[PDB]
Amino acid sequence: LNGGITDMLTELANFEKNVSQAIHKYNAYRKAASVIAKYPHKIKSGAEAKKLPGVGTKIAEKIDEFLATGKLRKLEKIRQDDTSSSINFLTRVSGIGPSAARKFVDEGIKTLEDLRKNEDKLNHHQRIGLKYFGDFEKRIPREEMLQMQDIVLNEVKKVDSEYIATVCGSFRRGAESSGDMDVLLTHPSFTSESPKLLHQVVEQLQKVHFITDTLSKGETKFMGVCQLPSKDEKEYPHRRIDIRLIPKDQYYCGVLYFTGSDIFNKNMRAHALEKGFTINEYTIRPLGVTGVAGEPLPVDSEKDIFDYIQWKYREPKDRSE
DNA sequence: CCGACGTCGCATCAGC
DNA sequence: GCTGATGCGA
DNA sequence: GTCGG
Ligand SMILES: Cc1cn([C@H]2C[C@H](O)[C@@H](COP(=O)(O)NP(=O)(O)OP(=O)(O)O)O2)c(=O)[nH]c1=O
Ligand SMILES: [Mg+2]
Ligand SMILES: [Mg+2]
Ligand code: NA
Ligand code: NA
């Protein structure tokens, strides 16, 4: 409904992040963009938008200019700037951030071709990102995601039937499509007060050719790439997968957070504060009278957390906000 | 006016 | 060689 | 860039 405006702002967001290296202005512009994307009227003036939490004066002027002229001078100029449009563009390769993109572009390396003639100046992560540049900007239909889930749960269980594994993120909320697969993994032998538990699982998903590459991997977090096996039909795009190993006592705080949504997590956490509780990704802790969080409270399911702060347990179907 | 604005695991660099 | 800092993604 | 202490 204000796509013209929310695109304008989303473009501005990226340049701040990618060219100006001003992460907070990026987030500001995104916040503005979100709040407007939900406003159910066609905006008529910058003054009208300025009412929304997150649209201040400078953005209200931009909207004014945009509504009157159909463009923004600053955006027009920057879009056409050889250096800046190039720095902004190379950041689309996973693993190249604004700092690596600046350096390339400084040494003349501007395009995906340029990257392709310079593999040796790229780290491992960045090469996988180049390799799969296209696939990484595709969404994943739920149908494939269910096929992916099948594989992960089968293979996890087959390594050791006592592992618990939950596919979280936009998939667990019932979205028709996902941008990646986030897997949360625990095992009764692993608690906070507690050692190749993640490795054996990556091992097995590699063994059956589900996991095809590795961005990064430690004792707790796996970041890599995976692909469904090819059915006649054309093969499946490579997909981003993360696998996290969480201690059992923090596992459900984990599930809940990595289930989201963003906005839902904000509310729930705010609410929980006003009920005298502190929730992070790991633990819910009781705020005392001066405001000192004491020991973490025992959690054994999701619903537990909801009880604690007296909220009606939420089916993830309804965790939009 | 002027500081907060998410926090953290992992890879890899800069410094010693 | 080790330790902390920075970049990156999410 | 926006907000708020
Ligand atoms: C990025 C982000 C994620 N989260 C939580 C909620 C997300 O649903 C969950 C996974 O994040 P995601 O993979 O970036 N977004 P998504 O999985 O809900 O949907 P998709 O990956 O865009 O398809 O992590 C936050 O609580 N704050 C954040 O800033
Ligand atoms: Mg800057
Ligand atoms: Mg996701
Ligand atoms: Na305002
Ligand atoms: Na990038």
CSV table of N, CA, C and O in Angstrom, one decimal, chain A residues 19-64:
chain,number,residue,atom,x,y,z
A,19,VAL,N,27.2,0.7,2.8
A,19,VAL,CA,28.1,1.7,2.3
A,19,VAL,C,28.5,2.6,3.5
A,19,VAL,O,29.7,2.9,3.7
A,20,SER,N,27.6,3.2,4.2
A,20,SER,CA,27.9,4.1,5.3
A,20,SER,C,28.4,3.5,6.5
A,20,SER,O,29.0,4.1,7.4
A,21,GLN,N,28.2,2.2,6.6
A,21,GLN,CA,28.6,1.4,7.9
A,21,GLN,C,28.0,2.1,9.1
A,21,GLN,O,28.7,2.3,10.1
A,22,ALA,N,26.7,2.3,9.0
A,22,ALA,CA,25.9,2.9,10.1
A,22,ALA,C,24.7,2.0,10.5
A,22,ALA,O,23.5,2.3,10.1
A,23,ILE,N,25.0,1.0,11.3
A,23,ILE,CA,24.1,-0.1,11.5
A,23,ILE,C,22.8,0.3,12.1
A,23,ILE,O,21.7,-0.2,11.8
A,24,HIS,N,22.9,1.4,13.0
A,24,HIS,CA,21.7,1.9,13.6
A,24,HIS,C,20.9,2.7,12.7
A,24,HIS,O,19.6,2.8,12.8
A,25,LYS,N,21.4,3.3,11.7
A,25,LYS,CA,20.6,4.0,10.7
A,25,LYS,C,19.9,3.0,9.8
A,25,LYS,O,18.8,3.2,9.4
A,26,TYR,N,20.6,1.9,9.6
A,26,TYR,CA,20.0,0.8,8.8
A,26,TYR,C,18.7,0.3,9.6
A,26,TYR,O,17.6,0.4,9.2
A,27,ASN,N,18.9,-0.1,10.9
A,27,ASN,CA,17.8,-0.5,11.7
A,27,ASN,C,16.7,0.5,11.9
A,27,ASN,O,15.5,0.1,11.8
A,28,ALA,N,17.0,1.8,12.0
A,28,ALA,CA,16.0,2.9,12.0
A,28,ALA,C,15.1,2.9,10.7
A,28,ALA,O,13.9,2.9,10.9
A,29,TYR,N,15.8,2.8,9.6
A,29,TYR,CA,15.0,2.8,8.3
A,29,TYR,C,14.2,1.5,8.1
A,29,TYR,O,13.1,1.6,7.5
A,30,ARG,N,14.7,0.4,8.6
A,30,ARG,CA,13.9,-0.8,8.6
A,30,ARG,C,12.7,-0.7,9.5
A,30,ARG,O,11.6,-1.1,9.1
A,31,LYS,N,12.9,-0.1,10.7
A,31,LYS,CA,11.8,0.1,11.6
A,31,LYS,C,10.7,1.0,11.0
A,31,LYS,O,9.6,0.7,11.1
A,32,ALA,N,11.2,2.1,10.4
A,32,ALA,CA,10.3,3.0,9.7
A,32,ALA,C,9.5,2.2,8.7
A,32,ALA,O,8.3,2.3,8.6
A,33,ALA,N,10.2,1.4,7.9
A,33,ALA,CA,9.6,0.6,6.8
A,33,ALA,C,8.6,-0.4,7.3
A,33,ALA,O,7.5,-0.6,6.7
A,34,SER,N,8.9,-1.0,8.5
A,34,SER,CA,7.9,-2.0,9.0
A,34,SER,C,6.7,-1.3,9.5
A,34,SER,O,5.6,-1.8,9.2
A,35,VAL,N,6.9,-0.2,10.2
A,35,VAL,CA,5.7,0.4,10.8
A,35,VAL,C,4.8,1.0,9.8
A,35,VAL,O,3.6,0.9,10.0
A,36,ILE,N,5.3,1.4,8.6
A,36,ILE,CA,4.5,1.9,7.5
A,36,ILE,C,3.9,0.7,6.7
A,36,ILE,O,2.8,0.9,6.3
A,37,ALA,N,4.6,-0.4,6.6
A,37,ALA,CA,4.1,-1.6,5.9
A,37,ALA,C,2.8,-2.1,6.5
A,37,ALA,O,2.1,-2.9,5.9
A,38,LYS,N,2.6,-1.8,7.8
A,38,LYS,CA,1.4,-2.3,8.5
A,38,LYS,C,0.3,-1.2,8.7
A,38,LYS,O,-0.8,-1.5,9.1
A,39,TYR,N,0.7,0.0,8.3
A,39,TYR,CA,-0.3,1.1,8.4
A,39,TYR,C,-1.3,1.0,7.2
A,39,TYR,O,-0.9,0.9,6.1
A,40,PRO,N,-2.6,0.8,7.6
A,40,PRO,CA,-3.6,0.4,6.6
A,40,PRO,C,-4.3,1.6,5.9
A,40,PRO,O,-5.6,1.6,5.7
A,41,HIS,N,-3.6,2.6,5.4
A,41,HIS,CA,-4.1,3.7,4.6
A,41,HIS,C,-3.0,4.1,3.7
A,41,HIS,O,-1.8,3.9,3.9
A,42,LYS,N,-3.4,4.7,2.5
A,42,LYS,CA,-2.3,5.3,1.6
A,42,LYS,C,-1.9,6.6,2.2
A,42,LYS,O,-2.7,7.5,2.2
A,43,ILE,N,-0.6,6.7,2.5
A,43,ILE,CA,-0.1,7.9,3.2
A,43,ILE,C,-0.2,9.1,2.2
A,43,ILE,O,0.1,9.0,1.0
A,44,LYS,N,-0.6,10.3,2.7
A,44,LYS,CA,-0.8,11.5,2.0
A,44,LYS,C,0.2,12.6,2.2
A,44,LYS,O,0.4,13.4,1.3
A,45,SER,N,0.9,12.5,3.3
A,45,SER,CA,1.9,13.5,3.7
A,45,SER,C,2.9,12.9,4.7
A,45,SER,O,2.6,12.0,5.5
A,46,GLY,N,4.1,13.4,4.7
A,46,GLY,CA,5.1,13.1,5.7
A,46,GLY,C,4.6,13.4,7.1
A,46,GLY,O,4.8,12.6,8.0
A,47,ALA,N,3.9,14.5,7.3
A,47,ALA,CA,3.3,14.8,8.6
A,47,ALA,C,2.4,13.6,9.0
A,47,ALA,O,2.5,13.2,10.2
A,48,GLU,N,1.7,13.0,8.1
A,48,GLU,CA,0.8,11.9,8.5
A,48,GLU,C,1.6,10.7,9.1
A,48,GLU,O,1.2,10.1,10.1
A,49,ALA,N,2.6,10.3,8.4
A,49,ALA,CA,3.5,9.2,8.8
A,49,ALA,C,4.3,9.5,10.1
A,49,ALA,O,4.4,8.6,11.0
A,50,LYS,N,4.7,10.7,10.3
A,50,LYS,CA,5.4,11.1,11.5
A,50,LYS,C,4.8,10.7,12.8
A,50,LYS,O,5.4,10.6,13.9
A,51,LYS,N,3.5,10.3,12.7
A,51,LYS,CA,2.7,9.9,13.9
A,51,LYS,C,3.2,8.5,14.3
A,51,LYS,O,2.9,8.1,15.5
A,52,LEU,N,3.8,7.7,13.4
A,52,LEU,CA,4.0,6.3,13.7
A,52,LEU,C,5.3,6.2,14.5
A,52,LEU,O,6.2,7.0,14.2
A,53,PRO,N,5.3,5.3,15.5
A,53,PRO,CA,6.6,5.2,16.2
A,53,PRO,C,7.7,4.8,15.3
A,53,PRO,O,7.7,3.7,14.7
A,54,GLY,N,8.7,5.6,15.1
A,54,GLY,CA,9.9,5.3,14.3
A,54,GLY,C,10.1,6.1,13.0
A,54,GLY,O,11.1,6.0,12.4
A,55,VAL,N,9.1,6.9,12.7
A,55,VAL,CA,9.2,7.9,11.6
A,55,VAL,C,9.3,9.3,12.3
A,55,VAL,O,8.4,9.8,12.9
A,56,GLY,N,10.5,9.8,12.2
A,56,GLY,CA,10.8,11.1,12.7
A,56,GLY,C,10.8,12.1,11.6
A,56,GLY,O,10.3,11.9,10.5
A,57,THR,N,11.5,13.3,11.9
A,57,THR,CA,11.5,14.4,10.9
A,57,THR,C,12.2,14.1,9.6
A,57,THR,O,11.6,14.3,8.5
A,58,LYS,N,13.4,13.6,9.6
A,58,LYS,CA,14.1,13.4,8.4
A,58,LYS,C,13.4,12.4,7.4
A,58,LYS,O,13.4,12.7,6.2
A,59,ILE,N,12.7,11.4,7.9
A,59,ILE,CA,12.0,10.5,7.1
A,59,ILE,C,10.7,11.1,6.6
A,59,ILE,O,10.2,10.9,5.4
A,60,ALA,N,10.0,11.9,7.4
A,60,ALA,CA,8.8,12.6,7.0
A,60,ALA,C,9.1,13.6,5.8
A,60,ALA,O,8.2,13.7,4.9
A,61,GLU,N,10.3,14.2,5.8
A,61,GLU,CA,10.7,15.1,4.6
A,61,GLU,C,10.9,14.3,3.4
A,61,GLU,O,10.6,14.7,2.3
A,62,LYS,N,11.5,13.1,3.5
A,62,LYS,CA,11.8,12.2,2.4
A,62,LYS,C,10.4,11.8,1.7
A,62,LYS,O,10.3,11.9,0.5
A,63,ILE,N,9.5,11.3,2.6
A,63,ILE,CA,8.2,10.9,2.1
A,63,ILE,C,7.5,12.1,1.4
A,63,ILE,O,6.9,11.9,0.4
A,64,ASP,N,7.6,13.3,2.0
A,64,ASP,CA,7.1,14.5,1.3
A,64,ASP,C,7.7,14.6,-0.1
A,64,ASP,O,6.9,14.7,-1.0
